[PDB]
Design a protein around this ligand. Structure first.
Ligand SMILES: NC(=O)c1ccc[n+]([C@@H]2O[C@H](COP(=O)([O-])OP(=O)(O)OC[C@H]3O[C@@H](n4cnc5c(N)ncnc54)[C@H](O)[C@@H]3O)[C@@H](O)[C@H]2O)c1
Ligand SMILES: Nc1nc2c(ncn2[C@@H]2O[C@H](COP(=O)(O)OP(=O)(O)OP(=O)(O)O)[C@@H](O)[C@H]2O)c(=O)[nH]1
Ligand SMILES: [Mg+2]
Ligand SMILES: [Mg+2]
Ligand SMILES: [Mg+2]
Ligand SMILES: [Mg+2]
Ligand SMILES: [Mg+2]
Ligand SMILES: [Mg+2]
Ligand SMILES: [Mg+2]
Ligand SMILES: [Mg+2]
Length: 92
RNA sequence: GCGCAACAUCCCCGCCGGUUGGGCGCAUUGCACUCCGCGCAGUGAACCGGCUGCGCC
């Protein structure tokens, strides 16, 4: 789960929030500490309430669990965690 | 073929299916990298398959 290091995985999000509003209301919050490459969100039955954001490299992504970890985001605390594997765009 | 919905407890809304998006509810704490859980309804939204009826060649 936690404690490898590739990118962030945010959990326990408000699923009522639509995809577009969520994808941008995180980029505006998660670039205070790094540059964002791509943010990914799905409202499917599994990946709803979860997000996948990747930055420049690894400690361009350690700079996230860094900050938030229970941020009252849309009336529910965040829970961030390092992505177990790596996103298929950084494998190049 | 073209244009329409009279019939409607103000107006608007012919019928049956369906799609996309919006709403509410149930369920979901879930590690992905093209979409996709389900239910409810005057969804005063846009459309797709048909059909009934009215008017005009
Ligand atoms: N004050 C306002 O701002 C306001 C608001 C709404 C309407 N209006 C006016 O009030 C008027 C009321 O008109 P309406 O809505 O009663 O008529 P309509 O114009 O809606 O209906 C005419 C059509 O009904 C169809 N039709 C008639 N009998 C039929 C039957 N037996 N079977 C199937 N189809 C049939 C025909 O195709 C006909 O062309 C309108 O002309 C409108 O201009 C005014
Ligand atoms: N101009 C015109 N063409 C028609 C009319 N009715 C049928 N047609 C022609 O017929 C074709 C088939 O349409 P349909 O609705 O299946 O014809 P239909 O079933 O005989 O029509 P009904 O008489 O109502 O039963 C259309 O493409 C038209 O060209 C009409 O009233 N006016
Ligand atoms: Mg009409
Ligand atoms: Mg009318
Ligand atoms: Mg009427
Ligand atoms: Mg009615
Ligand atoms: Mg219908
Ligand atoms: Mg729906
Ligand atoms: Mg819904
Ligand atoms: Mg149609």
């Amino acid at each position: 789960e936690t404690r490898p290091n590739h990118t962030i995985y945010i959990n326990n999000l408000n699923e009522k929030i639509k995809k577009d509003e969520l994808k941008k209301s995180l980029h505006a919050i998660f670039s205070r500490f790094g540059q964002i490459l791509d943010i990914l969100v799905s409202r499917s039955l599994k990946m709803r309430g979860q997000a996948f954001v990747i930055f420049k490299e690894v400690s361009s992504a350690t700079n996230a669990l860094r900050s938030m970890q229970g941020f009252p985001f849309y009336d529910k605390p965040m829970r961030i965690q390092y992505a177990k594997t790596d996103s298929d765009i950084i494998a190049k």
